Amino acid sequence: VSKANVPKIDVSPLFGDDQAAKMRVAQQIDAASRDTGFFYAVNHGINVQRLSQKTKEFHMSITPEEKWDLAIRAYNKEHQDQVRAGYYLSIPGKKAVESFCYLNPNFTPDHPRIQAKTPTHEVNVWPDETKHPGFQDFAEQYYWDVFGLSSALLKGYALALGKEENFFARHFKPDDTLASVVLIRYPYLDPYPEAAIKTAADGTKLSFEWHEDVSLITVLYQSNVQNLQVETAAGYQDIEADDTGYLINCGSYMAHLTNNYYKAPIHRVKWVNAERQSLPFFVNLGYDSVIDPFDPREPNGKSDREPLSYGDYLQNGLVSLINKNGQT
Ligand SMILES: [Fe+2]
């Protein structure tokens, strides 16, 4: 098994005003997006050691009582309003992974999309402040930190495609973004439950099967344990881990609006029996956001693809991924 070429891109110019320097970052984003589809963003300015420490404290101290109280509908029939946001329980002896998902902190009972009961909008659920002091403050702060990084990355993607730098970012707004953070624990277990390991066609033992992401882009921080593979024409290649950088890739909405010029890379998660964290931020736009598809290969950029509202895309895509790869 060979190793993927995943470049490290200093994204710090994307926060500045040196336009030539932004263009040089954009070129590197374009090159990586047309190759394996992944790159590491470095010099990003986020305190990832505090991110990992506070996430670890939460996963290790939450009790079965609290997990039931936070559980999404798939694990708790009482919580009909929690499809996305809440706790995704492990099943001892059967399912190893457990996770906690939260959405835009601005989604409150007073928010108009919540009042309208619009699909894919939910109010976050949180543990008791006295049992997890400072956790909600940290998690909401983190949402806006990675929102900021993601805004800057979207400027790079726009310039890479020959668009003005706000082409995507204008649709990525704090008041309505459907972006989510998932705090995922992959545990060390001895014996490891065989029901939690899948075998791929090529014999590789997996924790999560091949998929494309449901996102515009995905902005991922992982601890320093190698696990991801990306599909190429010549087979799957290992993505090296780096627990100081953010791993970036496009989701299938980008592939749609660029007529597959920037593909959504197919990737999968190898089984590794090690305690590790996986903290993705899925960059989603607003429910009514529509970007006219274009084709950068054509002089006039003309595309025959239909515009797709981000809300409809997200609703269909989340259901599809559960049905293909299972309830997480
Ligand atoms: Fe993924």
Short mmCIF file of C-alpha atoms and ligand atoms in Angstrom, two decimals:
data_model
loop_
_atom_site.label_atom_id
_atom_site.label_comp_id
_atom_site.label_asym_id
_atom_site.label_seq_id
_atom_site.Cartn_x
_atom_site.Cartn_y
_atom_site.Cartn_z
CA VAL A 1 0.00 0.00 0.00
CA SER A 2 1.45 3.35 -1.09
CA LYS A 3 1.24 6.77 0.53
CA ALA A 4 -0.83 9.66 -0.75
CA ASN A 5 0.75 12.97 -1.66
CA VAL A 6 -0.85 15.32 0.84
CA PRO A 7 0.83 18.73 0.78
CA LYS A 8 1.14 21.06 3.74
CA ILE A 9 -0.16 24.49 2.75
CA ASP A 10 0.56 27.57 4.84
CA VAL A 11 -2.86 29.22 4.78
CA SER A 12 -1.89 32.29 6.82
CA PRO A 13 -1.89 34.64 3.77
CA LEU A 14 -5.63 33.98 3.45
CA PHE A 15 -6.13 36.05 6.61
CA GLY A 16 -4.10 38.94 5.21
CA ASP A 17 -4.26 41.61 2.52
CA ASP A 18 -1.32 40.57 0.30
CA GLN A 19 -3.26 39.60 -2.84
CA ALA A 20 -0.35 37.98 -4.71
CA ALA A 21 0.37 35.82 -1.65
CA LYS A 22 -3.29 34.73 -1.53
CA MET A 23 -3.02 33.75 -5.20
CA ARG A 24 0.00 31.57 -4.45
CA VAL A 25 -1.99 29.77 -1.72
CA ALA A 26 -4.91 29.39 -4.14
CA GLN A 27 -2.65 27.73 -6.71
CA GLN A 28 -1.58 25.15 -4.10
CA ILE A 29 -5.23 24.48 -3.18
CA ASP A 30 -6.05 24.00 -6.86
CA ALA A 31 -3.14 21.63 -7.35
CA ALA A 32 -4.10 19.48 -4.36
CA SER A 33 -7.80 19.50 -5.28
CA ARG A 34 -6.99 18.18 -8.74
CA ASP A 35 -4.59 15.51 -7.40
CA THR A 36 -5.65 13.34 -4.44
CA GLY A 37 -8.10 15.96 -3.15
CA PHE A 38 -6.57 16.35 0.31
CA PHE A 39 -4.22 18.86 1.85
CA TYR A 40 -3.08 19.86 5.32
CA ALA A 41 -3.72 23.47 6.32
CA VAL A 42 -0.85 24.67 8.51
CA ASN A 43 -0.20 27.97 10.27
CA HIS A 44 -3.97 28.13 10.90
CA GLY A 45 -3.94 29.88 14.30
CA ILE A 46 -6.23 27.50 16.21
CA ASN A 47 -5.19 26.10 19.59
CA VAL A 48 -5.61 22.43 18.74
CA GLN A 49 -3.97 21.16 21.92
CA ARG A 50 -6.74 22.70 24.02
CA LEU A 51 -9.32 21.35 21.55
CA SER A 52 -8.03 17.82 22.01
CA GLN A 53 -7.65 18.08 25.78
CA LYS A 54 -11.17 19.35 26.42
CA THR A 55 -12.70 16.79 24.03
CA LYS A 56 -10.88 14.00 25.81
CA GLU A 57 -12.13 15.17 29.22
CA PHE A 58 -15.74 15.06 27.97
CA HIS A 59 -15.66 11.63 26.33
CA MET A 60 -13.95 10.07 29.34
CA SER A 61 -16.19 11.52 32.04
CA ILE A 62 -19.70 11.29 30.57
CA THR A 63 -21.88 8.60 32.14
CA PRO A 64 -24.54 6.27 30.69
CA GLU A 65 -27.27 8.39 32.33
CA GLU A 66 -26.06 11.54 30.62
CA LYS A 67 -25.71 9.76 27.25
CA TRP A 68 -29.35 8.68 27.30
CA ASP A 69 -30.37 12.26 28.21
CA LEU A 70 -28.41 13.65 25.23
CA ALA A 71 -29.07 10.86 22.77
CA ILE A 72 -30.32 11.44 19.25
CA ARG A 73 -33.61 9.88 18.09
CA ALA A 74 -31.92 6.74 16.75
CA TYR A 75 -31.01 5.78 20.33
CA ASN A 76 -33.85 7.44 22.29
CA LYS A 77 -37.44 7.42 20.94
CA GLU A 78 -38.36 10.32 23.25
CA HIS A 79 -36.08 12.73 21.35
CA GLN A 80 -38.00 13.09 18.09
CA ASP A 81 -36.52 16.57 17.52
CA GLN A 82 -32.87 15.38 17.68
CA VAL A 83 -31.90 13.90 14.34
CA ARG A 84 -28.52 15.59 14.00
CA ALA A 85 -27.56 17.18 17.30
CA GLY A 86 -26.76 15.15 20.40
CA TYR A 87 -24.97 12.03 21.51
CA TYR A 88 -24.41 9.00 19.26
CA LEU A 89 -23.97 6.06 21.62
CA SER A 90 -21.57 3.18 21.33
CA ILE A 91 -23.01 -0.29 21.78
CA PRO A 92 -20.72 -2.39 23.97
CA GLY A 93 -19.65 -5.57 22.22
CA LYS A 94 -21.06 -4.34 18.88
CA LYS A 95 -20.30 -0.71 17.98
CA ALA A 96 -17.10 0.95 19.10
CA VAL A 97 -17.38 4.54 17.95
CA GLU A 98 -19.28 7.17 19.89
CA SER A 99 -19.71 10.83 19.08
CA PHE A 100 -21.30 14.13 20.02
CA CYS A 101 -22.63 16.44 17.30
CA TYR A 102 -23.53 20.10 17.67
CA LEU A 103 -24.80 22.76 15.28
CA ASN A 104 -24.80 26.54 14.92
CA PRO A 105 -25.01 28.02 18.46
CA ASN A 106 -27.27 30.72 17.03
CA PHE A 107 -30.04 28.15 16.51
CA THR A 108 -32.16 29.00 19.52
CA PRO A 109 -35.88 28.56 20.16
CA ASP A 110 -36.17 32.20 19.06
CA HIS A 111 -34.40 31.64 15.71
CA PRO A 112 -36.81 31.97 12.77
CA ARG A 113 -35.77 28.66 11.13
CA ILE A 114 -36.48 26.96 14.43
CA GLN A 115 -39.84 28.71 14.75
CA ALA A 116 -40.67 27.57 11.20
CA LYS A 117 -39.56 23.99 12.00
CA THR A 118 -37.42 23.94 8.91
CA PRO A 119 -35.68 20.56 8.37
CA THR A 120 -32.01 20.12 9.38
CA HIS A 121 -32.18 22.99 11.91
CA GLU A 122 -32.12 21.95 15.56
CA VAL A 123 -31.32 23.49 18.92
CA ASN A 124 -28.19 22.04 20.49
CA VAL A 125 -28.41 19.87 23.59
CA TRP A 126 -25.70 20.12 26.21
CA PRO A 127 -24.65 18.27 29.35
CA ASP A 128 -25.07 19.69 32.83
CA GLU A 129 -22.69 22.61 33.43
CA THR A 130 -21.98 21.36 36.94
CA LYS A 131 -20.87 17.93 35.72
CA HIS A 132 -18.90 19.32 32.73
CA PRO A 133 -17.80 22.83 33.73
CA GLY A 134 -16.71 24.99 30.82
CA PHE A 135 -17.46 22.39 28.17
CA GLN A 136 -20.27 24.28 26.40
CA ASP A 137 -18.29 27.53 26.50
CA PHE A 138 -15.29 25.77 24.95
CA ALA A 139 -17.37 24.00 22.30
CA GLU A 140 -19.23 27.15 21.18
CA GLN A 141 -15.98 29.12 21.07
CA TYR A 142 -14.41 26.34 19.00
CA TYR A 143 -17.31 26.47 16.51
CA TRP A 144 -16.56 30.15 15.77
CA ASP A 145 -12.78 29.57 15.64
CA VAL A 146 -13.09 26.87 12.99
CA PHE A 147 -15.80 28.94 11.27
CA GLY A 148 -13.19 31.66 10.90
CA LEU A 149 -10.60 29.28 9.51
CA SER A 150 -13.15 27.83 7.13
CA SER A 151 -14.17 31.25 5.87
CA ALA A 152 -10.55 31.93 4.96
CA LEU A 153 -10.18 28.55 3.22
CA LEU A 154 -13.29 29.28 1.14
CA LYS A 155 -11.59 32.45 -0.10
CA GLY A 156 -8.71 30.28 -1.27
CA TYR A 157 -11.05 27.90 -3.08
CA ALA A 158 -12.80 30.77 -4.81
CA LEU A 159 -9.54 32.31 -6.07
CA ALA A 160 -8.34 28.86 -7.18
CA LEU A 161 -11.39 28.56 -9.45
CA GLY A 162 -11.00 32.06 -10.91
CA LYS A 163 -13.78 33.68 -8.87
CA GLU A 164 -13.78 36.70 -6.58
CA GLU A 165 -12.76 35.70 -3.09
CA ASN A 166 -16.25 35.96 -1.55
CA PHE A 167 -17.88 33.64 -4.12
CA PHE A 168 -18.48 30.89 -1.55
CA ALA A 169 -17.95 32.79 1.66
CA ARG A 170 -20.88 35.14 0.99
CA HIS A 171 -23.17 32.12 1.54
CA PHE A 172 -21.40 31.02 4.75
CA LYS A 173 -22.90 33.19 7.45
CA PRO A 174 -23.07 32.93 11.25
CA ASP A 175 -26.82 33.53 11.37
CA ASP A 176 -27.83 30.56 9.21
CA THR A 177 -24.97 28.13 8.48
CA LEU A 178 -25.91 24.44 8.72
CA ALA A 179 -22.27 23.57 9.54
CA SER A 180 -21.70 21.01 12.27
CA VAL A 181 -18.94 19.86 14.59
CA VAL A 182 -18.71 16.17 15.50
CA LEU A 183 -16.53 15.13 18.45
CA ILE A 184 -15.73 11.46 17.70
CA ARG A 185 -14.08 8.98 20.05
CA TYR A 186 -12.51 5.85 18.60
CA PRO A 187 -11.62 3.71 21.61
CA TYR A 188 -8.98 1.18 22.40
CA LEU A 189 -10.76 -2.09 23.20
CA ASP A 190 -9.39 -5.48 24.13
CA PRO A 191 -10.99 -7.67 22.84
CA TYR A 192 -12.12 -5.49 19.97
CA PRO A 193 -15.70 -6.39 18.94
CA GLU A 194 -15.65 -8.09 15.53
CA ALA A 195 -19.06 -6.63 14.68
CA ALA A 196 -17.38 -3.20 14.70
CA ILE A 197 -14.84 -4.17 12.02
CA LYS A 198 -15.80 -4.26 8.35
CA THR A 199 -13.82 -6.07 5.67
CA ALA A 200 -13.38 -4.23 2.40
CA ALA A 201 -13.36 -5.87 -1.00
CA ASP A 202 -9.54 -5.69 -1.05
CA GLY A 203 -9.23 -7.37 2.38
CA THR A 204 -8.50 -4.24 4.43
CA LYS A 205 -10.11 -4.10 7.88
CA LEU A 206 -12.15 -0.94 8.24
CA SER A 207 -13.93 1.14 10.83
CA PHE A 208 -15.94 3.11 8.23
CA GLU A 209 -16.48 2.24 4.57
CA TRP A 210 -15.84 4.24 1.43
CA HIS A 211 -17.83 7.43 1.05
CA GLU A 212 -17.88 10.96 -0.26
CA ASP A 213 -18.51 13.65 2.33
CA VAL A 214 -21.81 15.54 2.59
CA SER A 215 -20.30 19.03 2.72
CA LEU A 216 -18.95 21.87 0.68
CA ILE A 217 -15.59 21.23 2.32
CA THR A 218 -14.60 19.24 5.42
CA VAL A 219 -12.15 20.69 7.95
CA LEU A 220 -10.80 17.90 10.14
CA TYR A 221 -8.55 17.72 13.19
CA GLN A 222 -7.45 14.18 14.20
CA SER A 223 -5.06 12.88 16.77
CA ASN A 224 -1.74 11.46 15.59
CA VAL A 225 -2.85 7.96 14.56
CA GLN A 226 -2.81 7.00 10.90
CA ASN A 227 -6.17 5.76 9.69
CA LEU A 228 -7.45 7.46 6.54
CA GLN A 229 -7.13 6.21 2.97
CA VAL A 230 -8.09 7.92 -0.27
CA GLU A 231 -9.11 6.15 -3.44
CA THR A 232 -7.15 6.69 -6.63
CA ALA A 233 -7.38 4.91 -9.94
CA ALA A 234 -4.47 2.71 -8.84
CA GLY A 235 -6.07 1.85 -5.50
CA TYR A 236 -6.27 3.15 -2.00
CA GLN A 237 -3.41 5.22 -0.58
CA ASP A 238 -2.64 5.98 3.06
CA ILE A 239 -2.98 9.56 4.30
CA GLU A 240 -0.27 10.30 6.86
CA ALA A 241 -1.43 11.74 10.15
CA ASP A 242 -0.42 15.18 11.44
CA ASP A 243 -1.90 16.32 14.75
CA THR A 244 -0.84 19.95 14.34
CA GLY A 245 -2.60 20.59 11.02
CA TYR A 246 -6.11 20.48 9.70
CA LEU A 247 -6.89 17.97 6.95
CA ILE A 248 -9.06 19.54 4.24
CA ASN A 249 -11.07 17.94 1.46
CA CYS A 250 -14.07 18.80 -0.71
CA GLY A 251 -17.52 17.33 -0.28
CA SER A 252 -20.01 16.40 -2.93
CA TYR A 253 -21.61 19.86 -3.13
CA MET A 254 -18.29 21.23 -4.46
CA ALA A 255 -18.18 18.43 -7.04
CA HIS A 256 -21.70 19.34 -8.14
CA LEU A 257 -21.12 23.05 -8.56
CA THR A 258 -17.77 22.60 -10.42
CA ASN A 259 -19.06 19.88 -12.79
CA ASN A 260 -16.65 17.48 -11.06
CA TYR A 261 -13.57 19.65 -11.73
CA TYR A 262 -12.91 19.47 -7.98
CA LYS A 263 -14.05 15.93 -7.19
CA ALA A 264 -15.22 14.87 -3.79
CA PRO A 265 -12.53 12.31 -2.95
CA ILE A 266 -13.66 8.87 -1.96
CA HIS A 267 -12.06 7.86 1.32
CA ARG A 268 -12.41 5.26 4.06
CA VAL A 269 -11.23 4.71 7.64
CA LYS A 270 -8.95 1.80 8.48
CA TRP A 271 -9.45 -0.13 11.66
CA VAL A 272 -6.72 0.64 14.18
CA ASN A 273 -6.96 -0.51 17.77
CA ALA A 274 -5.89 2.71 19.41
CA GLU A 275 -7.56 5.42 21.46
CA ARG A 276 -7.96 8.38 19.13
CA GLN A 277 -10.05 11.45 18.34
CA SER A 278 -11.60 12.62 15.08
CA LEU A 279 -13.08 16.15 15.15
CA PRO A 280 -14.59 17.14 11.79
CA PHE A 281 -16.25 20.43 10.98
CA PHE A 282 -18.54 20.05 7.99
CA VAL A 283 -18.75 23.33 6.11
CA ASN A 284 -22.39 23.66 5.08
CA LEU A 285 -24.10 26.74 3.70
CA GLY A 286 -27.59 28.05 4.55
CA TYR A 287 -30.82 26.22 3.85
CA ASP A 288 -31.76 28.37 0.87
CA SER A 289 -28.22 28.92 -0.45
CA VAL A 290 -27.93 28.21 -4.16
CA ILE A 291 -24.76 28.50 -6.22
CA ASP A 292 -25.13 28.37 -10.00
CA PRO A 293 -22.99 25.43 -11.21
CA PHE A 294 -20.17 26.31 -13.60
CA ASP A 295 -17.52 24.39 -15.52
CA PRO A 296 -13.98 25.82 -15.20
CA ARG A 297 -12.83 23.71 -18.15
CA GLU A 298 -14.96 25.74 -20.53
CA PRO A 299 -13.98 29.25 -21.69
CA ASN A 300 -17.50 30.51 -20.90
CA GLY A 301 -17.86 28.38 -17.75
CA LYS A 302 -21.19 27.08 -19.02
CA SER A 303 -22.62 24.07 -17.17
CA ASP A 304 -25.80 22.10 -17.93
CA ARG A 305 -26.20 21.04 -14.28
CA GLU A 306 -29.20 22.19 -12.31
CA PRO A 307 -28.73 24.52 -9.36
CA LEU A 308 -29.29 22.65 -6.12
CA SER A 309 -30.51 24.31 -2.93
CA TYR A 310 -28.12 23.54 -0.10
CA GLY A 311 -30.94 22.51 2.25
CA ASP A 312 -32.35 19.90 -0.14
CA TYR A 313 -28.83 18.62 -0.83
CA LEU A 314 -28.13 18.26 2.87
CA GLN A 315 -31.39 16.52 3.74
CA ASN A 316 -30.95 13.95 0.96
CA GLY A 317 -27.27 13.48 1.59
CA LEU A 318 -27.39 12.84 5.32
CA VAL A 319 -30.09 10.17 4.90
CA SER A 320 -28.19 8.59 2.00
CA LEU A 321 -24.98 8.26 4.01
CA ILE A 322 -26.77 6.58 6.92
CA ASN A 323 -28.46 4.14 4.55
CA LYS A 324 -25.20 3.29 2.74
CA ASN A 325 -22.67 3.21 5.60
CA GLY A 326 -24.87 2.73 8.68
CA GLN A 327 -26.09 4.67 11.70
CA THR A 328 -23.07 6.24 13.42
FE FE B 1 -15.44 11.53 5.31
#
